[PDB]
Each structure stands twice: as C-alpha cells, then as structure tokens.
C-alpha cells in the first residue's frame, strides 16, 4: 500500500480529472481542478521535487486558479455529467484491476505493474538538492530562456491591456 503511494495519488488525480472533465459547471470544474492540482502536487512531492510542487501551490493554485475562480464567480452568477463520470470511472477501474491482476498493461505503450519506487537512484547528492541547482542555473546558463520568457510576459501585459480595453 504505502509503497504504492504515488500510484494511489495518481489514481486520485485521474479520478479528479474525470470528475471535472464531465463539466457540471465552471464552478465545480474549478473545484475539482483545485483538488486535482493538490494531489498532482503530492505526486511531484513524492519524487523529491519540493520546489516544483511548491511552484504548483504558489503559482498554479495560488495565482491562476484563483483568477479562474475569480472570473467564474462574477461571470456566471445533469444526466450526462453523472453518466460520463461513471463511464470514465469504469474505464479507469478496469485499467486498475487489469494492472492489479497482470502486473503489465499496454494502452498505447507498454507499462509496468510494479510499485514506482523501482525507478530511483541509491546515492546522495552532497550539500544540494539537484533540482534546486537546476533551477538556480536559470540565471547563470539560461540567458536566452529568461530573455524570451520575460519578453513574452511583457508582451503579455501589453496584449491584455490592448484587448481588455474594448476600444
């Protein structure tokens, strides 16, 4: 069970995506996507990517989904929802029972049925997180990347001020 905790959070992630992708409303769609962003962040956090999971919480659920809920809550105020939900959940639990009994499954590629702890490394990285140094190399190596990203954000500000102007 506990060896399969990334698998359990992945199943909960897919269940959340089938939950809001059947689209009852943009409000409950945002609610299910918030819960899915939290559990997918937990999936990221169980591989040692603490900074990228905190980027999920701080940026995705912190700014962007807050602005989605902010726009949804002031600009809006089934059978097929429940049917598509149980359809997707039956597809997912058929896949779950297949990989529980078979330890192997092919949907598009071939996939393992073990616990996903088996794909790691057994060493230590000294006095740094490897992923922390990789993101710290954004400024010392990624000159072109930071230039094109900052220019895209400046043009993003300009574009939003143009098209929300109305005139």
């Amino acid at each position: 069970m506990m060896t399969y905790i990334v698998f359990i959070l992945s199943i909960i992630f897919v269940m959340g995506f089938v939950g809001f992708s059947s689209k009852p409303s943009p409000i409950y769609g945002g609610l299910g996507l918030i819960v899915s962003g939290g559990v997918g962040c937990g999936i990221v956090l169980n591989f040692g990517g603490s900074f990228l999971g905190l980027m999920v919480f701080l940026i995705y659920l912190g700014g962007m989904m807050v602005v989605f809920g902010y726009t949804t809550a002031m600009a809006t105020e089934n059978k097929v929802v429940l049917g598509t939900f149980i359809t997707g959940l039956l597809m997912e639990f058929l896949m779950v029972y297949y990989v529980l009994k078979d330890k192997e499954v092919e949907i598009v590629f071939k996939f393992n049925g073990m616990g996903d702890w088996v794909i790691y490394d057994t060493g230590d990285s000294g006095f740094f997180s490897e992923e922390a140094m990789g993101i710290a190399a954004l400024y010392s190596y990624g000159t072109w990347l930071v230039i094109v990203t900052g220019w895209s954000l400046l043009i993003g500000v300009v574009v939003i001020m143009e098209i929300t102007r109305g005139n």
Partner: peptide
Amino acid sequence: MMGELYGLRTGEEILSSTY
C-alpha cells in the same frame, strides 16, 4: 537500480530506503 538492490528485501526496508 533501487530495485536491483532492494528487490527481494522486505517492505519496511524498501520504504525506509525509497522514501
């Protein structure tokens, strides 16, 4: 690999070494 060392071993050892 982690599974090439801790393949046959018990689950408590595997969890204490893998998470």
